[PDB]
Amino acid sequence: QQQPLPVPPLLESRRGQPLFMTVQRAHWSFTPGTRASVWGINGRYLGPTIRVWKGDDVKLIYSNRLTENVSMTVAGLQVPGPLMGGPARMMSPNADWAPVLPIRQNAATLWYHANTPNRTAQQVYNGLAGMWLVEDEVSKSLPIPNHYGVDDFPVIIQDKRLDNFGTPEYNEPGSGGFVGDTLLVNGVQSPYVEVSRGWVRLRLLNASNSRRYQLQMNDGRPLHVISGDQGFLPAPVSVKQLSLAPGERREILVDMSNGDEVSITCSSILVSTLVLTLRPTGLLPSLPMRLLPTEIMAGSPIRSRDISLGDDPGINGQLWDVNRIDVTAQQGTWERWTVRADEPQAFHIEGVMFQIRNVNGAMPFPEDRGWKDTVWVDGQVELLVYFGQPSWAHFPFYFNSQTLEMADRGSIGQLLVNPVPR
């Protein structure tokens, strides 16, 4: 018998007031199993789901109540380098950080997490992560499920290794990324979610240190993808197996009208491949033919770049160097980036949005044709990157392996985006 899917509380303003985020040990009552502690935001394991609106200027007030330094970031958020932030905006124990974020991007499922240099893998694993939703006029008008915690749920996936009491424990891997043998969704092992007989929206986010998931429905039906690291696809895409690498987000719609139960499923070997069970209640209450009003146009790349990742920490043969700018781009411009990895892993770029143009010389799958900020690289990919945000030498954007331990080990590069205007 599984436990109910925990629904992170929705944290939004509306009154132009600040969103308070206290990084702290989770309450025992939110901690599994019953001995070791875990972390989160505001007393929870993991954090609340933030919801903001395109056009808002949101005041975030972070407070660090942990015994070590913590820097927090919103992955996929389009803001200037100094607002990201990272090591230059790190919070010492008991200190705070109150940035004002100008939300200007389209609707998307983003996420926030600790990005403390050297401690990212451990801090995210410990529970320093949560979902971040951007809503806009488009998402508000779409005929899709949107009642948060009713027919629209966050699905935060993490693979862990539990101690003798059922509490996730971390052991730094000697090589590569951390891999667990137990799946947790929103902090619970293979939970179920009770839904009515209609469409349900799941916002899938891979918040694991390194594991890449290959998701499918246990009854063989297709997964109807509607987004989108950086937003909606032009129209829904129905796939049999969905890849979800660390840091990727995809929103799917599941039709529970048949009144039957359906589960999403995925050494190294997992104790269970059960991700989330959609348990019908018998209650009664398609999909849209188009999501985005326009399959948005991409610009002409003025330059190309080549990025190489491997089984050894570093990018392009170099470890991350805070003093070194690896790429200098011009804001408002487009570039073609070729990313290669002989050791399969996800790749993330801060301060941009990109469209995958080719995967190993072939077309990318439909679910991968919208705007993104994270990509699974197994061989080579070609990206059409847009630099819509500015950054500065001491507040650069990072591009990195999404394998958390690898990033911690130096698989990070620095991107300077000269401001336009200036």
Author numbering: 30 to 295, 312 to 330, 335 to 471
What did the authors write?
The two molecules of each asymmetric unit are essentially the same within experimental error (rmsds over 408 and 406 Cα atoms of 1.1 and 0.9 Å for the orthorhombic and monoclinic crystals, respectively). Of the two data sets, the orthorhombic crystals diffracted to higher resolution (1.9 Å compared to 2.6 Å). The structure of SufI, determined here at a resolution of 1.9 Å by X-ray crystallography, confirms that the protein belongs to the multicopper oxidase family. No electron density was observed for the hexahistidine affinity tag, with the exception of the arginine residue of the affinity tag linker in chain A of the orthorhombic structure. The main areas of difference between the two crystal forms lie between residues 42–47, 55–66 and 326–334. Residues 42–47 are found in a loop that leads into the first domain, while residues 326–334 compose the long linker between domains 2 and 3. The electron density for both of these regions was poor and often missing entirely for the side chains. This suggests that these differences between the two crystal forms arise from flexibility of the molecule in these regions. Residues 55–66 are found in an extended loop in the first domain: a short alpha-helical segment is present in this loop in the orthorhombic form, which is unravelled in the monoclinic form.
SufI is a water-soluble, periplasmic protein. The sequence of SufI shows that it is a member of the multicopper oxidase superfamily. The overall structure of SufI is very similar to that of CueO and contains three cupredoxin-like domains. Indeed, access to the region of the structure that forms the active site in multicopper oxidases is blocked in SufI by highly conserved residues. Together, these observations suggest that SufI is neither a copper-binding protein nor an enzyme.
